[PDB]
Ligand code: HEM
Ligand code: HEM
Ligand SMILES: N=C(NCCC[C@H](N)C(=O)N[C@@H](CCN)C(N)=O)N[N+](=O)[O-]
Ligand SMILES: N=C(NCCC[C@H](N)C(=O)N[C@@H](CCN)C(N)=O)N[N+](=O)[O-]
């Protein structure tokens with residue numbers, strides 16, 4: 099069927115047909131919606147490959163051509179013989195860009211076509227991975243004028259020689275459990291911060307300690323490496339009015355770079371595919387800084403602002419939230435590092451949605467993730483109906499390696 | 506089947522078995538989620554089973570399942586249906602049914618209060634004047650001089666579909682909206698079409714910014730009739746700020762009694778098309794949506810200007826700053842006038858406790874995340890971090906088409 103999507107603020111209705119080409123399941127049923135759940139063979143492979151090549155050739159206006167047919171046969175014979183195949187550089191680039199295009203939880207997809215792809219399929223070791231990663235970080239950071247990029251390591255073979263980056267993001271802060279029973283640094287990384295020590299790392303036991311990369315190549319045991327500090331761009335956070343702010347001693351890194359997902363293109367699985375773009379202000383100011391299970395800093399900021407924290411209805415938490423997020427943005431813009439506010443980013447997404455609807459017939463989107471964690475309804479996406487469904491190529495979740503690795 | 510739901514802030518995991526009793530569809534499929542879509546005359550045939558299901562739930566709730574009283578009621582209803590094609594609920598079943606439609610309302614964050622609902626039985630009502638009297642009594646009881654009390658008034662159920670009782674207003678109390686020839690709107694933009702119908706029907710509009718609309722009431726399928734709610738019965742709150750003395754000069758005020766009046770209440774297969782209900786406001790409803798939605802009063806700029814915020818660029822977060830103050834004001838004004846209201850922090854925290862309680866004593870709590878999470882400060886409320894399962898249980902409150910689109914004028 100053909101579904102319709104309405105924006106309740108502008109009345110604009112869009113019709114969706116792209117969903118009709120969905121393959122994977124959503125987790126929902128006619129009886130129950132799981133829209134808010136965080137995570138709901140040669141014979142198998144060729145179909146997948148064919149589906150992919152078909153869209154690739156269609157995208158380049160050579161659908162059904164001899165080239166298309168030839169390629170389809172070549173891959174067909176390759177799988178039948180090698181039980182797998184290799185993507186052409188062209189198909190690789192198209193695949194990665196589209197996996198981003200299809201990321202229903204990503205609000206910055208208007209940038210999807212401008213992705214620098216780094217082919218690391220010739221990589222064989224952890225030092226090699228480190229080398230490729232350092233080059234990605236430097237390229238993408240670009241002294242503050244961030245550029246989206248992804249580095250693709252060798253695809254899975256027999257699952258016994260998988261490449262993996264154990265970190266969740268290339269750059270994050272350490273987390274240690276203290277005697278107090280409290281947590282020093284980032285609580286979200288406590289466990290990882292331990293496996294780094296349990297492996298050899300010498301933690302400074304600080305509040306913002308850039309973690310070491312834990313790289314795994316060809317199924318081997320992961321190895322540690324410290325990213326040249328000169329390559330980790332960091333922003334000290336200050337407020338454009340509260341000169342006391344700085345004493346909070348807060349800072350964040352400029353490069354968001356998801357490194358634990360799995361990239362699936364034409365059936366092939368790339369288990370190590372770190373990618374990066376740039377931050378939306380709220381990710382740091384609202385989630386990293388104010389989540390109760392994270393740096394949980396609202397109370398401190400509240401106190402220095404000297405506001406009545408006696409009653410929830412004074413909305414001190416909300417007032418502080420705003421100020422903190424004003425600081426994050428302020429600091430990044432001041433240090434000339436790329437960053438986008440939730441207002442501008444959501445506006446962009448709406449524009450992207452409209453482009454996608456008319457040039458592609460739709461845009462899979464997960465409302466639960468697209469709407470910013472603060473000021474939801476004053477951003478346009480809140481009033482925008484969205485249809486969520488899975489399309490390939492795609493970025494998928496995968497088990498944390500330390501729960502699957504056989505040392 | 507069992508389903509796990511987890512809170513990513515506390516790691517608490519709950520198990521849901523309640524969903525096994527969901528009959529109605531959700532709009533989603535194994536291939537598509539319609540979770541953010543706002544809205545995705547029965548036969549004797551499908552009526553008795555609907556009745557039986559309900560009566561079994563009722564008798565089980567009172568620990569009399571399988572009793573003689575239970576079996577006789579089933580036989581009594583079955584006969585009545587075969588005989589008259591419908592059936593009447595006992596007062597007790599009506600009350601139980603009403604409370605459960607609220608208890609099952611997956612988009613309602615105030616459900617911790619479900620068991621305390623005052624049900625007014627208006628099934629003996631035959632005319633619009635009769636409806637007006639019932640509604641006046643409901644508004645006065647509910648308002649209770651500012652100490653709000655949850656209530657619902659239930660008018661006669663649908664029979665053949667040509668004799669429906671309907672409250673044409675979407676809420677018993679709402680402000681008029683007027684579109685000017687220059688394209689701008691005076692009052693509340695959301696109520697413009699309804700305001701026009703009221704004028705066409707004879708209402709003398711005072712054409713101001715906060716004019717309480719007249720009730721347009723339809724009884725037994727007849728053409729609707731106009732009634733003005735006694736002003737002394739309509740409690741309102743002037744909006745001022747704890748620190749901004751100029752806020753009061755924005756000329757804002759809101760009514761204190763929220764009362765949805767356009768939903769359909771379904772109990773045991775029976776359809777109640779006019780069932781106005783009221784509780785009390787969560788601050789953000791007024792402060793974030795009614796006041797700051799671009800298509801509503803939209804006061805962000807004017808408030809931002811007076812605060813002398815940097816409006817040159819969005820990254821100054823002037824909108825976000827103005828938003829908090831306005832919401833501080835709404836809460837402050839209500840508490841000062843001693844009119845019940847709840848802020849989003851307290852409301853969401855209570856809902857999590859209610860939800861956990863429901864999972865243990867009931868096996869679940871259908872909830873719509875998209876609606877439950879507040880329109881501001883989303884992630885600093887516990888619900889944002891809570892996984893929820895949405896499904897439909899009856900009894901329930903359902904949407905129904907606006908009456909002006911279906912009514913056959915006499
Ligand atoms: C350049 C601007 C970019 C912006 C502003 C942006 C913004 C966002 C935001 C705010 C999220 C949610 C993060 C969270 O809540 O954890 C997100 C998620 C995501 N983005 Fe983008 N993104 C950008 C670039 C990228 C790139 C370059 C890719 C892919 C190559 C991408 C793929 C995804 C995926 C797959 C997710 C979901 C990850 C998860 O489930 O944890 N994003 N993005
Ligand atoms: C005790 C006070 C109550 C509070 C604080 C509360 C709060 C809320 C809020 C914030 C909404 C969302 C409104 C919107 O965004 O349009 C809502 C929706 C809802 N509530 Fe409650 N509520 C209360 C009492 C009730 C009562 C008395 C009933 C039923 C007897 C009820 C039934 C529902 C239903 C059916 C919806 C969804 C309405 C729609 O879809 O438009 N609520 N509630
Ligand atoms: N802006 C991005 N955000 C995604 C990564 C940052 C995100 N806020 C985050 O903390 N993700 C966690 C996963 C959150 N559950 C991680 N993978 O370390 N991506 N980007 O490439 O531009
Ligand atoms: N707090 C309540 N809120 C629901 C009613 C107010 C809501 N903010 C509102 O404006 N609802 C619109 C529907 C909004 N789409 C209506 N039916 O007039 N309900 N209550 O019983 O206490």
Ligand SMILES: C[C@H](O)[C@H](O)[C@H]1CNc2nc(N)[nH]c(=O)c2N1
Nearest residue numbers: 134135136466467889890891892
């Ligand atoms: C339970 C719920 O799914 C969870 O808290 C989601 C909500 N929306 C989100 N949205 C984004 N962008 N990122 C998140 O981590 C979440 N967490």
Ligand SMILES: C[C@H](O)[C@H](O)[C@H]1CNc2nc(N)[nH]c(=O)c2N1
Nearest residue numbers: 480481482483541542543875876
């Ligand atoms: C499109 C989207 O579903 C829509 O704007 C929803 C989102 N969440 C909501 N939540 C509540 N409580 N009330 C609403 O009117 C809405 N509108």
Ligand SMILES: [Zn+2]
Nearest residue numbers: 126131533538
């Ligand atoms: Zn769904």
